[PDB]
Design an enzyme around this catalytic site. Sequence first.
Site, PDB file in Angstrom:
ATOM      1  N   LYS A 117      -0.185   1.502   9.811  1.00 44.02           N
ATOM      2  CA  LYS A 117       1.025   1.202   9.062  1.00 44.02           C
ATOM      3  C   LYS A 117       0.693   0.396   7.813  1.00 44.02           C
ATOM      4  CE  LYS A 117       5.830   0.460   9.759  1.00 44.02           C
ATOM      5  NZ  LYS A 117       6.028   0.033   8.345  1.00 44.02           N
TER       6      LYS A 117
ATOM      7  N   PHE B 123       1.649  10.772   3.000  1.00 45.19           N
ATOM      8  CA  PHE B 123       1.523  11.088   4.416  1.00 45.19           C
ATOM      9  C   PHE B 123       2.480  12.184   4.869  1.00 45.19           C
ATOM     10  CE2 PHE B 123       5.182   9.409   6.795  1.00 45.19           C
ATOM     11  CZ  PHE B 123       5.875   8.805   5.766  1.00 45.19           C
TER      12      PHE B 123
END
Lengths: 28, 51, 422
Positions: free
Chosen positions: C258, C336
């Site tokens: 993250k 992503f």
Amino acid sequence: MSGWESYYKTEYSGRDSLIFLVDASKAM
Amino acid sequence: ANLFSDVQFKMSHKRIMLFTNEDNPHGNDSAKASRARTKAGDLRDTGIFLD
Amino acid sequence: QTVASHVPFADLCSTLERIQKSKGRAEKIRHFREFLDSWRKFHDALHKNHKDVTDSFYPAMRLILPQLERERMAYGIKETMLAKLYIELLNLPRDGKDALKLLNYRTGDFAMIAYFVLKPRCLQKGSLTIQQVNDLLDSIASNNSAKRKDLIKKSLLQLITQSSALEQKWLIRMIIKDLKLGVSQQTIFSVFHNDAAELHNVTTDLEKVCRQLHDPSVGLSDISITLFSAFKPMLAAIADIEHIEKDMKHQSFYIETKLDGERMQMHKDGDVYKYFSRNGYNYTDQFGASPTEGSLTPFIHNAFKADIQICILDGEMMAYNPNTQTFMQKTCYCVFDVLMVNNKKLGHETLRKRYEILSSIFTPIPGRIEIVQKTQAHTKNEVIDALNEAIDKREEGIMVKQPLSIYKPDKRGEGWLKIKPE
């Protein structure tokens, strides 16, 4: 061409059961 | 019947006269015969007098 | 050239009667599916030289589901008024059995009584199409709004005189807004489309649902994402490690590090660069709209391969220090996810295909734009090791992704999982 009509068509297992029925009349 | 119901005045007698030489109009269809019978019965119940 | 103009109301009435008569839900669903397939095939065969015509199943869907009719106001003719109007228009005797039956319906519904009354009187074959019925109902509603009962009476008389007893009963049920076909609204929407009930709930309308969800193959994902449009990105849900293996049915998942960056989305089309935020705010000025303007945009134009011309991406924005080669927590870009490439839309495709095509979008270049680092894991020990590595790297936590998960914008859950120490 066709029409709406062409697309839209016209359009031993178990167990034995027995019941005994007996008259209760005087003659019996 | 619709014509009869469109009269604003008071009607003492409601009468219809049918001029026709045919006696078996709906000989090729029975549903129309039943519809006519029902309509005639309704008119008779309402108070319409037919000849 | 609306399809309803060529579809007699009698066919719809017969389909509804067959659905009601059928006992099993399978038969009802089969009948509805056959009717829908016939309608769709006729629509496809009719609008060949089309220009995205705004014709859909709404004319029949509204009648099938009167309770959802919001375009038309209250008709103003309820069961008692309908029985009275049937009495005057049909010229029945006020004391005749039919009149009392219609009036004395125990305020075995009124529709059945009306059908029995009209059976000996009505015709055997009507001549009104769905469009004509809808027009007459709209006229009745408008006249009721305008307080003109003469036109309402005329329209009702026309409907009565140009329909069969079954059609009269179905029209009465539609006017009363009570059909009870044996299949719930949810089932009807599901057979109509897989993503129809939720779309109707969020939008609160039928015409939009009918039009947008016309092609069964095209799901809500394709229409939820559009070029030069600001859509709502989804988000993960907090989950505990102790039960992480139970989240995805013990199947293989993807672990992503993250990043504490602002979530934003970007669209590339030739020499045009559009930017948007999670809330729809536009920040294209910060990075410019052309390769000749901005700080980040000029350095990414050459990154995209020649095979990529029109594309849409979503990612996180952060700050990067090349001197220490570090990422500063709260210009470098991590990508992503890709939602559209060329003509085709990638929303329908699951996460695995998106990841596969990500490598073919552009060559990663550190400092300006690249692909977020991630791995594939299927064990709790792998998740623990990834979390430990992230913490050692000062990262907030880990993201767990299910390849089988699909793109469902504006929804919480699915394969998007956010794991943090606690």
